[PDB]
Point group: D2
Chain length 470, copies 4
């Protein structure tokens, strides 16, 4: 069972709008909203959304596998070897947020300070001592962006696996000689950096010029979670405030996906007239180019919604009914909706490009969707005894049996996958976890979990104290 | 008769290799090589070439008209008005080297110091006094590259005309209101800058993603000058030194064009066996990315000439027979051919990207091909009396009748086209002329003119003296 | 009683080296080391130091007042009005870590997310509603470094006060007209930005070209804390590992200050022979240019310790006894001492330039000295009932009397000074507090507090859990 | 006899204002204005000046020798060896416009294309073949500004000589080992780059913080050319147009120098009342920070001329009598004087910082003062037979005795000095010559030569023709 299986199972449930019944849904950790900083929902006047992996949650592992297959096919078409066609996506390998080291060709899981938690070269997991040869301080400088690329989006899951497949393939194929920074094929030398760049370019190509969008929209039932509670929640938001869409996607793709998401024989609730998806938004903006959107942005354009093309010129007119915007900036949204940053709850999955930047640059309130949480929670609670044991062992130090710490850390981590939990390795939190705590005011497996809280709800987190204050 | 008609007429002539006969060809100014700095041909050990508009001279106005049509069609496809489809390319308007002012939407012909010689807004030629409102010092800062774009390649001729067509169209169409920096269409404002960017992007699109290459290669006889003397000259070069190709074009396009250029029922001379185009080069490099090529370049790759794809990896091996390179840098060429810069004569049409940069960055010797010269010479000699008269009038000043200077300047210029000579307006030299004198050691309407000089020839220019030395 | 009075009082105490007695010193919160992340002291092989406000703690408010006076005198000498000479430093105004807004001339205390906690224009504290006119979202973008300057060093305390004095003076002097971004004096307009730049330049001038160093070294007893336990602790460090100095100061100043710090009629303990300060260090590096030191650094030079001048050339030789280095980089230290980053405990006061950068760029362990903590602890414990009351009030919300929250927040804050605690305003933590927690592994009012812990000590912090893990 | 001896000799001559007599002064090449582009003096409405080496011509070799001595003393004070004190400035070595190669420690004289004309390592002149080892193509990339520094100001003459002295000293002193990129002194390595940087910093120090200004103003008769015709010419300029000063120097230095330049017992002509120097200018601007002045500039300030300090604030008021400006931009001058660029003749010695930039960025007309011309003309005419012979030899080629070309080139060049003419080596023009021709509309040994032409004069240069036009 994947995380999207959980989401789709919860999606198939009709709501019961009884206040006591919605409150009781928050028994299950799966339906909760989690709180890093306090947020009085009564002060939120605008709810903003990203589309991909937020409103449109792509089913796993099917969508990752499609991306993988198309990326492989593109690499083969530009001259990579035919053996790539025998690879098959394996959802049990990648965890999101890994760092590809382009110098040595390793995937690294790191903490918020760049300390190594896991190091794999292809499919070989390198133990601590062997790691010191390449990482003498078991540390990387993660802002050396020429060397390290952080794979922190769900769209990066197929390339996370593909990088490891490629390193493994070239290492074990006798045509190539393994060197410390790449592979030698006679008078050709393929550095891990060049290989990585080829992969990154191919993933981009598949999204922008290849068939990924076309294949997705041909079979939306296969590729996209659909939930009758989406229209209901968005309708309740629009009763208390304004609702907006700000997506990097183009209008044509957005319209196909959103039409599908709202394709039920009813509107917000069963028995109600169906309403077009656009009627749920006070403001619709596509081609947003986030993160640049949260600084200078690009010029504000208007979409000709009959053709899907942009009208010629910068749009200088007012917010009007039926208009669709393209480009612009986060200030556009504030100005057109008459909002200040703290009046906005922005709902998205991109912990950097959206959540971090909207928070740091604009002081927006933030809700982070983490699709994997649906499955990470099941593992966390199910294997709570292992972590409890780890926490007991860490305590038990009067000042060997640190290999029991390593064993239990290994067994815990393997329950999540080969690269472990998104949030930790044993007792050490990942960079991704630290970024979630720092920049996501609220988070959950789905934003639909807001359905289970009233709009006057006060989401509370404990006041933080420094060590000398404690 | 276009400049390419002249080139093709001279192309149809079989050579007579009699030394006296080849020397007598240099009667006609049309067959001469012109000299800005002295060059002892005996010291040249390597001859290097660009392909486009150098080896492969595209026929005019047919190729410009094709580019124009495809660019228009692309703009219409992205949402420009259908009326664009009624435009038709007019070769009598554009002269190469004009500056588009993106603030005010004017085409400007300027001297080497940025002084205005000609200013047109659409198809309205603005007289001197009216020019002062927008250009108070009749001057532009040409290195303000955010505002001014210099249209100095032959590929820029269609967009030169298209910019003027667009300014004219929007000015005279009652749907739009003319403003000083663009056009208002209700709540849309299209700046001249945005319009220019759309045009530039569309020209790029047509070359890289559209059908321009496909349409060219479907009818090479229509679009490309072919000359049996090309193989002959290149064969003579290879007897005295090394020959190389360094082109921005890709291998597949290069191979189609070059195959056509050498498709005769013979090799260098009639009666000789035909030889493949690649046999004429000691070194073949495609995807050169000039001008970057003359600094750091890009990594050296090898072309798989069976597939037209790049082999995977950086190429680390030696110069070998049959290899085709991709990317690299000008140092690659020097190293692989064992040459120093002054041993190289580099032959090309791009007065900036190639000739200027190879000279300034590497000290290569330079030969500039200027296709328009074939027709500019006919006008210069034919209307020599007008210039003579202008030169007499300038002299005749004891220290009105400056309007006779303006009249004669106008009539002279109109013989060349609406934007005048590539090289001057009346007695004032253009920026393009100044750049040719400064960076092209030799220049001519075609590099084939080298056929008429022996390889021991000493091309001589007079020693330059400062005014106080004279 | 200032924070340096506390430090000097604790400095006058002779140590009792009895293990039970040193352990009992850590009763008092004042003598503790506080722990943000666990640190096994047994793994530290190198102890590194900054000098200023770390080894050499300047007495307060005397040193701030000297800096203030000299800065004022410099501004007057370059043409500011004579009335500046009537200002007198007031230690009750500035708190460290404030942000000067150069657009509107305000001092701001902000949280880690840029939310406004306190806003003063000159000496006028602006209440919440009035703050919205200039800060509509009660938020600033703190990385807009062209607009906002963060005053986070102890050397910035005099200019913090001077900025407020200047804004107040120009506002209330009838020669000038107050505008929203500065002051008008007829045909002169002095923006807050220009004024700020003048102040910043004058503070720099006083440190680098003026008399601050000379006046300090003429009366070290007045200006610098001296503690017989310093040599003792450094001697114990050198028994278990290596000790180094890396200071931005020059050799001549360093030697004067360090000579004073070790000028007792004994060495590490009473009865022992006095030893020169240099004998306490395995490596001495001056002119470090931190933070650049933690990236590329500058070339490694050697100090001629007889003249205080640099020897000519880059130093290419080995670590040798008696050598003093200048410039270099953090890698120099690692290489010369044979250390990896995690083997180093770097001890300093500069929460950005040293502690943050050594941690992020190199993975060094960090100990932050916070001189004000000595007094902030006395206030925190003494007025613990007020905070307790605030914490109770925050709890008491069933979901007015938020003005009791504002009242109690005000009274709590005023016990620290006019700009409140370095660490918080009421229940909200400051940016400075957040940076301390994030980047300082350990912190204390003085590094001398390490004297009270054995070198095998395991400093422990609780494992952090995400909200969904709790 | 130095060039300043010539200038001072011509300075001692009283004018005879008889029109026939002033015209006859232009017999002598020494009193002419030379013309690169035509300039109708009748259209010039504003005359602008730099001060140093333009109005205030420093006497040679005395001023160079003072700069040299103070620069040496500064290097010794920061730790260079005492032997530097035995160096003595030698005016027969340096020619202006040489390039210091910081990689190999050579002084190079180059043409406009970076071709090597002369190469000296210390005082060893390297012949052609030996030059190829370090310069394989006898070429440098002169815009590699990290490697090459062009010594093109008269203030650079002392450091030109000092660089050669230092290279010579370290090469021949047995304490140091000569390496290809610097010198080894045990465990110290002094690169030519570091040495160059020390020299450059010391020259800057001497001008900005040392005693050069103080020593100059203590003995102005020794150090500065004074000419009673200066006030006369400036008075005639002010009758036909506006006059301005735009200098990088500060007000205090400017006032000392300018007071001296106008200290005669009369005003413009003998018998007239003396008038203060400021009365000769419609606009006085100091601290100009050229070349930045010709782009964005700095904020406009006003000088308090009683104190020599800046008034506080940006100056927002109008041009008024008696005001002195500081900073600003070239637009300030245009706006305040109501001028367009082509109405301005800007008179200066800095062929880059002023003449090039005012021309390229603003389209100002330009007059370049070249103090050395006064002596270069005497050599050019005196040894005209040698150049004539060189020109004959170059001609005499039917297509050995190229060593006669080298011999005659050597003997010609040696008449100017060890590094030859500022303008050429034999038949090859220098970079400096090419820049003069390209950017100086007019040039002369002194701007005082304008006294010999009426203000209606039409300065004429021949129309330039391309080779194909000839």
């Amino acid at each position: 069972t994947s995380w999207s299986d959980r989401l789709q199972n919860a999606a198939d449930m009709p709501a019961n709008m009884d206040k006591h019944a919605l409150k009781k849904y928050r028994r299950e950790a799966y339906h909760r909203v989690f709180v890093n900083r306090s947020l009085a929902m009564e002060k939120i006047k605008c709810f903003g959304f990203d589309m991909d992996y937020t409103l449109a949650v792509y089913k796993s592992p099917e969508y990752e596998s499609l991306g993988f297959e198309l990326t492989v096919e593109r690499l083969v078409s530009i001259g990579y070897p035919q053996e790539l066609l025998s690879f098959a996506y394996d959802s049990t390998f990648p965890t999101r947020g890994l760092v590809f080291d382009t110098l040595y060709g390793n995937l690294l899981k790191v903490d918020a300070y760049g300390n190594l938690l896991v190091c794999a070269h292809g499919f070989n997991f390198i133990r601590g001592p062997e790691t010191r040869e390449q990482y003498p301080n078991k540390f990387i400088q993660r802002d050396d962006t020429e060397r390290f690329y952080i794979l922190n989006t769900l769209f990066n899951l197929p390339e996370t696996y593909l990088l490891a497949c490629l390193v493994d393939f070239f290492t074990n194929c006798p045509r190539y000689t393994s060197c410390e920074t790449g592979f030698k094929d006679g008078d050709l030398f393929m550095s891990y950096r060049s290989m990585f760049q080829d992969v990154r370019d191919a993933v981009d190509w598949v999204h922008y010029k290849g068939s990924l969008k076309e294949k997705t929209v041909e079979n939306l039932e296969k590729y996209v979670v659909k939930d009758g509670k989406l229209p209901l929640l968005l309708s309740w938001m629009k009763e208390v405030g304004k609702v907006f869409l700000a997506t990097n996607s183009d209008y044509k793709y957005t319209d196909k996906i959103m039409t599908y998401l709202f394709d039920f024989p009813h509107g917000p609730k069963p028995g109600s007239s169906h309403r077009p998806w656009q009627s749920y938004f006070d403001l619709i903006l596509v081609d947003a180019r986030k993160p640049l959107f949260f600084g200078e942005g690009t010029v504000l354009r208007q979409v000709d919604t009959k053709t899907g093309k942009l009208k010629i010129g910068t749009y200088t007119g007012p917010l009007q009914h039926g208009i669709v915007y393209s480009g612009g900036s986060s200030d556009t949204i504030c100005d057109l909706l008459g909002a200040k940053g703290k009046d906005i709850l922005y709902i998205g999955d991109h912990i950097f490009g959206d959540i971090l930047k909207s928070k740091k640059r604009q002081g927006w309130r933030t809700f982070l969707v983490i699709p994997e949480l649906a499955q990470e929670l099941h593992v966390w609670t199910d294997k709570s005894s292992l972590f409890e044991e780890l926490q007991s062992l860490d305590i038990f130090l009067a000042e060997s049996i640190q290999r029991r710490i390593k064993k239990v850390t290994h067994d815990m981590d393997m329950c999540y996958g080969m690269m472990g939990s998104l949030f930790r390795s044993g007792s050490r939190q990942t960079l991704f976890a630290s970024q979630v705590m720092r920049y996501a005011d609220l988070y959950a497996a789905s934003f639909i979990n807001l359905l289970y809280y009233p709009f006057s709800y006060l989401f509370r987190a404990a006041h933080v104290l420094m060590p000398h204050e404690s």
